[PDB]
Amino acid sequence: PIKRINVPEIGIATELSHGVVQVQFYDGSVVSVIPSMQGGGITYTQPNGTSTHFGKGDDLPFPVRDRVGQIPNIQLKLKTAPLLGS
């Protein structure tokens, strides 16, 4: 964990060392992506705990699309947080 910020109504966003941005939504769902990587893929965990990986060519169902769409705004917010430990 390099950075972490709570974003009201949305969730808790964490930037990880490996370049992964993870958002734990307040409904219990989770999405994780690699924004710097053109071939990265997406991991999505349902509230119920079922998790699925989607490779860059894979069709994304609505719930995945919609959560991955939260990421750019979340990256802007992560930029404004200091580093963990600072």
From Swiss-Prot:
Q: How is it modified after translation?
A: Ubiquitinated by the SCF-slmb ubiquitin ligase complex; leading to its degradation by the proteasome during interphase and regulating centriole number and ensuring the block to centriole reduplication.
Which cysteines link up through disulfide bonds? Answer: none
Q: Where in the cell is it found?
A: Cytoplasm, Cytoskeleton, Microtubule organizing center, Centrosome, Centriole
Please state every residue range assigned to the domain named POLO box. Answer: 1-80
Annotated tissue distribution:
Expressed in testis (at protein level).
Assembly and binders? Homodimer. Interacts with Alms1a.
Could you say which protein family the record assigns here? Belongs to the protein kinase superfamily. Ser/Thr protein kinase family. CDC5/Polo subfamily.
Q: What does this protein do?
A: Serine/threonine-protein kinase that plays a central role in centriole duplication. Able to trigger procentriole formation on the surface of the mother centriole cylinder, using mother centriole as a platform, leading to the recruitment of centriole biogenesis proteins such as Sas-6. When overexpressed, it is able to induce centrosome amplification through the simultaneous generation of multiple procentrioles adjoining each parental centriole during S phase.
Instruction: State what protein this is by name.
Output: Serine/threonine-protein kinase PLK4
The organism of origin for this protein: Drosophila melanogaster (Fruit fly)
